[PDB]
Amino acid sequence: GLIYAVGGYDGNTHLNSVEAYDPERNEWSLVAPLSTRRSGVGVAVLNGLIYAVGGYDGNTHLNSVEAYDPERNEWSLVAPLSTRRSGVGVAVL
Amino acid sequence: GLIYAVGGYDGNTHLNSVEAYDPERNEWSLVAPLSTRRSGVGVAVLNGLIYAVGGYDGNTHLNSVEAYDPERNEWSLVAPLSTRRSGVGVAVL
Amino acid sequence: GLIYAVGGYDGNTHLNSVEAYDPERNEWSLVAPLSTRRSGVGVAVLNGLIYAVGGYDGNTHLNSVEAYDPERNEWSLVAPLSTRRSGVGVAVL
Numbered sequence: 001g002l003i004y005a006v007g008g009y010d011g012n013t014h015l016n017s018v019e020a021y022d023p024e025r026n027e028w029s030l031v032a033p034l035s036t037r038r039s040g041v042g043v044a045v046l047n048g049l050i051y052a053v054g055g056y057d058g059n060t061h062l063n064s065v066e067a068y069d070p071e072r073n074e075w076s077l078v079a080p081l082s083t084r085r086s087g088v089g090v091a092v093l
Numbered sequence: 094g095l096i097y098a099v100g101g102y103d104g105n106t107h108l109n110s111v112e113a114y115d116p117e118r119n120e121w122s123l124v125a126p127l128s129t130r131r132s133g134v135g136v137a138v139l140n141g142l143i144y145a146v147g148g149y150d151g152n153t154h155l156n157s158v159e160a161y162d163p164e165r166n167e168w169s170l171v172a173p174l175s176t177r178r179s180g181v182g183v184a185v186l
Numbered sequence: 187g188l189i190y191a192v193g194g195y196d197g198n199t200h201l202n203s204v205e206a207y208d209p210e211r212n213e214w215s216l217v218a219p220l221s222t223r224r225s226g227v228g229v230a231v232l233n234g235l236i237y238a239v240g241g242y243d244g245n246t247h248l249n250s251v252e253a254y255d256p257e258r259n260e261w262s263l264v265a266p267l268s269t270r271r272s273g274v275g276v277a278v279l
Contacts, residue, residue, distance in 0.1 A: 003137050003185050005146050008178030011154045019175055021158070023139060026172045042229075043135075043182030044189050046209060050184050053191050061197045065207070070186060079212045082205055085194030089229030089276075090182075091236050092189050093256060096230050096278050098239050101271030104247045112268055114251070116232060119265045136228075136275030143277050163279060183275075 004031075004068075006052050007038035014039045014058040018068070032073045035066055042090030051078075054085035061086045097124075097161075099145050100131035107132045107151040111161070125166045128159055135183030144171075147178035154179045190217075190254075192238050193224035200225045200244040204254070218259045221252055228276030237264075240271035247272045 003021040005028070007014070014037040019028045038055030045051070050068040052075070054061070061084035066075045096114040098121070100107070107130040112121045131148030138144070143161040145168070147154070154177035159168045189207040191214070193200070200223040205214045224241030231237070236254040238261070240247070247270035252261045 001139065001185075003139055003144055003146070003183060005135060005174055005178055006182040006184070008133075008135075008147060008176075008181035009154060010177040015176065015178060017176060021144075021172070023171075028172060028174055030175055038182075039180035040133075040194075040226075041180070041182040042191060042194075043184045045184045045186045046187065046189055048186070050186055051189055051207075052182060053189070054194060055180075055182075061195060078209075079207070079214060081191055081214055082216055083194075083201065083203060084196040085191055085201060087180075087225035087227070087241075087273075088194035089192040089224075089227040089238060089241075090189060091192070091229045091231045092187075093231045093234070093236055094232065094278075096232055096237055096239070096276060098228060098267055098271055099275040099277070101226075101228075101240060101269075101274035102247060103270040108269065108271060110269060114237075114265070116264075121265060121267055123268055131275075132273035133226075134273070134275040136277045138277045138279045141279070143279055145275060148273075148275075180273075 004050055006043045007041045009039040034075055040086035042088040044090045044092045046092045053090045054088045056086040097143055099136045100134045102132040127168055133179035135181040137183045137185045139185045146183045147181045149179040190236055192229045193227045195225040220261055226272035228274040230276045230278045232278045239276045240274045242272040
């Protein structure tokens with residue numbers, strides 16, 4: 001029941017930070033950041049984990065993928081994509 | 094059972110417009126626009142509302158967030174992110 | 187139970203390729219590509235299909251929309267948006 005906002009680009013850097021919105025309280029709070037800065041990142045939820053797929057870290061388009069476990073507040077890197085992808089769409093089916 | 098397309102960038106302006114697709118009829122129709130133009134916007138659905146998170150309005154990267162109620166066809170602004178984020182990934186967990 | 191990564195931009199071209207992640211095996215595999223290269227594409231899942239909405243193909247911002255049927259491994263084009271939209275957010279409600 002939370003909305004997670006993962007990465008992106010502010011007016012100054014590509015972001016590794018992640019924040020979560022609680023609609024009951026109308027508040028966002030920062031949680032554990034990604035391993036890598038990622039804008040243009042695709043995000044999906046599968047088996048209670050949040051996957052962050054691809055993006056751009058300021059230095060290169062990314063093929064890496066990492067998964068967030070809310071029960072532990074940590075991200076871990078998993079198998080990368082076949083190709084670097086920023087501006088990627090992600091869905092779970 | 095509708096697909097909402099929120100904001101974006103055409104070949105001429107960043108967009109505040111929003112349109113909804115009905116697969117039964119293979120048609121898109123325009124609904125109420127966002128308060129702000131937003132490309133690179135993250136969108137998620139929680140408690141029957143559509144949240145539009147961050148993006149870019151042509152003038153600045155955005156920390157603002159707004160929520161759409163389909164029963165009223167209106168968007169309203171809620172608490173902003175801690176940081177401006179365009180190219181942000183959003184998921185609900 | 188798979189995560190699909192649709193389109194995007196590598197360090198060399200806008201992408202029509204699509205790959206699917208199986209968390210049980212920690213592997214991605216390439217499936218049928220989109221009709222069009224699409225970065226900045228919005229993706230959502232409705233009635234067992236994956237919709238790819240808008241984006242950019244290297245030549246132009248896109249109003250086209252296509253839908254993937256995993257049982258047939260094919261994409262087909264459906265009704266386009268009213269407006270070209272890349273950097274578009276997409277959700278299903």
